[PDB]
Design a protein around this nucleic acid. Structure first.
Length: 299
DNA sequence: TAACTTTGAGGCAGACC
DNA sequence: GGTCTGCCTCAAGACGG
């Protein structure tokens, strides 16, 4: 079904990439209490109410082709194959209950819903989002990344990229200067939440530091310069700051995603198996989502 | 067969020039 | 004065076909 009133948008469809493993996990985290067994219906409801919410925003803004991007670390992330400390990061909440449940729901989404579910074992949600934004932003589409992950601010260098934070209800705003600079900060000073260290210390600094340890100060001057001429990495830096830098690029700058990976992702997506706008009504019932049939053209 | 245990922002301390 | 880093707390779900 699509007999409509959809006010004058654009040929090159507006697209909404959704950092899935955010909106589900961190919604579960604020919405579900301490050690009480998190059950599949608790999980499912959350995920669909959360999809609905977001989609309304996405569809009421110009963005119509929705994509759900999921972390798949089953065989280990590629970034973690290159650098074992990556996101290794070093309970009364039912982690396991939430997880076993959400895998089930993912499958159902792949199965019964109108969304490209980008999930490829070994690639992160960030890869899907980063890559697909590069492709389409250049191809003429308008893009909206739904996610509060500051790491995506580097993707704002690309035209017609806006970002919404599902949690805090603001627009994610470019943070000091340009995105080129923003990227170069996480490159040089590293990214604590991702376990990426400054280029002024060892690789696995965050995963191995002894107490007392501090990262040597990194002048902003150096950041701004290099950001404006990455040829300055060779001058402003030591030989080992510079190698640490080359290693941080892979880990942080999305431009450094292997090409092979960017095809593998776009291949999956071009050829994705999108199911019929009608299996929706028979999954709600299948599962127990009675209360939802009555608002469904909302997807 | 496998693993995935949020996010930033706003304070506040101490080290450096 | 100012800049840099690290640590600690905080608070974040929109059901007319």
């Amino acid at each position: 079904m699509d007999l409509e009133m959809m006010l004058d948008e654009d040929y090159k469809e507006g697209i909404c990439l959704i950092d899935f493993s955010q909106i589900a996990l961190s919604t579960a985290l604020v919405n579900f209490p301490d050690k009480e067994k998190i059950n599949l219906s608790m999980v499912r409801h959350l995920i669909l109410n959360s999809i609905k919410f977001n989609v309304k925003k996405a569809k009421t803004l110009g963005y119509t082709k929705i994509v759900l991007c999921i972390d798949n670390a089953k065989s280990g992330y590629w970034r973690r194959d290159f650098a074992y400390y990556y996101k290794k990061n070093r309970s009364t909440w039912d982690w396991e209950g939430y997880f076993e449940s959400s895998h089930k729901v993912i499958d159902e989404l792949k199965a019964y819903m109108p969304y490209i579910v980008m999930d490829i074992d070994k690639y992160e949600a960030n890869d899907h989002i980063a890559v697909l934004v590069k492709k389409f932003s250049l191809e003429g589409h308008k893009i909206l990344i739904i996610s509060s992950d500051g790491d995506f601010t580097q993707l704002h260098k690309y035209p017609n990229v806006k970002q919404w934070s599902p949690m805090h209800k603001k627009w994610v705003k470019i943070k000091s200067g340009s995105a080129e600079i923003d990227c170069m900060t996480k490159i040089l000073k590293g990214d604590k939440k991702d376990n990426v260290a400054s280029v002024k210390v060892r690789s696995d600094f965050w995963f191995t530091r002894v107490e007392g340890e501090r990262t040597p100060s990194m002048k902003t001057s150096i950041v701004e310069a290099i950001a404006n001429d990455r040829e300055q990495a060779k001058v402003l830096l030591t030989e080992s700051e510079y190698n640490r830098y080359k290693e941080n690029l892979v880990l942080i700058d999305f431009d450094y995603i292997p090409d092979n990976i960017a095809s593998n992702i776009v291949n999956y997506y071009n050829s994705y198996k999108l199911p019929p706008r009608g299996k929706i009504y028979s999954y709600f019932v299948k599962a127990g989502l009675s209360k939802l049939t009555n608002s469904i053209n909302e997807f």
